[model samples]
Target: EKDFKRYGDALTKDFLNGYKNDHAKEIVDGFRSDMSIKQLVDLFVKGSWSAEQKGALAWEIESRALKVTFQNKSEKYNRLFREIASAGVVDAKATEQLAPQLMLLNLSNDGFGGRSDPLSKLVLVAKQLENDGQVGVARQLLEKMYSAAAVLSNPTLYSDSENANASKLLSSLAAIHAKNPMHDTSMKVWQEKLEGKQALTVNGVVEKITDASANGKPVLLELDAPGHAMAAWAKGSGDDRVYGFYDPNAGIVEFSSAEKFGDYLTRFFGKSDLNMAQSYKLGKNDAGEAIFNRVVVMDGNTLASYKPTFGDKTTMQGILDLPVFDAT
Candidate 1:
């Protein structure tokens, strides 16, 4: 690596001093036919001399490395590619400079039938970059993965193993977005791909609430209140209907009566229907004080475990005790 850097610096200086473009081209071309890691590293170093030149050179290195790796499953070429791709994380300038090339490489690899390994490896490097705090780079690469997965025409080309890999990448991206809630664009990408359309918006909340009520199933609600998240299990019908509120932090707090729950829903959502109650909570005083926490409903979704057949007897305990519900 150090030797490559030395040669690369020399090359850069020579080019700046009016060396012919053909000399630079000749040096880069030499790496294509047969090159050791040292030669590849030297070529990469020359490419890294300027942001303007880095992208095209990085792409060449990546492409050639990928081709070599595919032919022999060569660990050397794999290592070289990993190093080049990871530049986005290690070098600040490389992050923006190499993004387009990296995205293109990811897409190109996806075109190769049964050659998803390169794509998977690229994602792995991006994930590491994310873990190391290079979020923008990681997101760009994962977005390409999402794009590739979305347009897959040959399911056989994307094996179950590759699908699992892509899913893990998507989940990681979603978690990153959730952690930094201020960026709605990132959060929307996470929600739309993982939870379906309009999931991060008010409409989605209403849809889930209505769906759960109509289906008579319990729906999990994530509240916007500071330090408070709760779940509501809709039970009963008409005047007898009540919502059982379960807080991992506050234990079980059921509505005093179905009327109270309805009143709470009406005040919070401007509607008596359960659709608005899906994921958010209402304030104790806003509805009717049963000594409840101040609830600010944000989003809700129908729970798969809750079924109408369970009947009206389902309590906070019933919702809490479900194997899927975690108190912690």
Candidate 2:
């Protein structure tokens, strides 16, 4: 990292004085001639050189770091964000300096910034960041969303919907902020508020759309959403990390598609309707041989919605992979 210090040394007014100003090409050549992302960031935060020069350099560092994570292969976004967000933690001005440019990625679809629903993606990304103890990034993202909401709203539809009622941006913005400890820690242990084995906090929150009534214990708090008249999916829910429900078989398969998922469930227990909250008993297939015993079916929300479905059958569980994201 110190190798970049040579370039930093030249950035000083004294080094750039007299002949240094005339031979700008020499310094430019050395800086660009030998550069690395790690080195750029380290110096930007550490060195004491440059005359209003660090902003552009800082911008370059932050912009490309984000591009690498969002445009490159994957998983590192949270960690990458930790580094970028950390810059703000140290200087407190890094984010204030360059967040606007970062939000302008809608320029190209080939780029991750061109995501059709950019803010929505950020919401989930922020959730993952929050879970990973990188809430600094999460906090920065929510503030951006809050700013976006106060404006005329982005052209992108909320969750791919064209209706105003279905817009989740407003709700989700409030959700992340309310739950984020960066703002307040009162909401921590929300999972403990729910009763039962499967009671956990998905990206955060649990709601049984079935209106399973109420029993008591840890206390209840429900937030509303657009789709169902009942209640919002436990206030500010996202598809990142679901908090409620556990696979009794512990063989939770990877989620592919609704069609494929239904086909899979149909291959087992009875009935083709995999969306219903009901118990299923595995029986013989076309060949006449039973493969499993009890099978309980419910959309992701309902299954993990309440107290252990039938005793220990439902235990407190949180899954990184979302089996079924939407319930229609």
Q: Compute the lDDT of residue 94 as modeled in candidate 1.
A: 33
lDDT per residue for candidate 2 within 15-82, as digits (tens), equals: 33422232211222223312446756565556563443454454444544565454343234435755
Output the lDDT of residue 240, model 1.
41
Superposition TM-score, candidate 1 onto the true structure: 0.20
* Model 1 clash number: 6
- State in Å the error of residue 146, model 1: 44
Judging by lDDT against the true structure, name the best candidate.
Answer: 1
lDDT score of residue 278 within candidate 1: 30
TM-scores of all models? 0.20, 0.19
- Show pairs that collide, candidate 1: 209-275, 210-275, 221-279, 279-300, 280-297, 281-297
Off by over 4 Å in 2: 1-209, 214-328
For residue 115, what is the lDDT in candidate 2? 22
Tens digits of per-residue lDDT, candidate 1, 1-328, equal 5865564564344433323222222233343423444555666655444532443344444555554444343345545766886866575433211111122222323322222222222222332233334444423543445444542322223545554555544443333323332133322211112122212333333344444445433333443322223344443345443354333322333463655654554445444443323323333332342222322232222111122222344321122222211124
Query: 60, model 2: CA deviation in Å?
Result: 12
The global C-alpha lDDT for each of the candidates, from Candidate 1 onward, is 0.36, 0.30
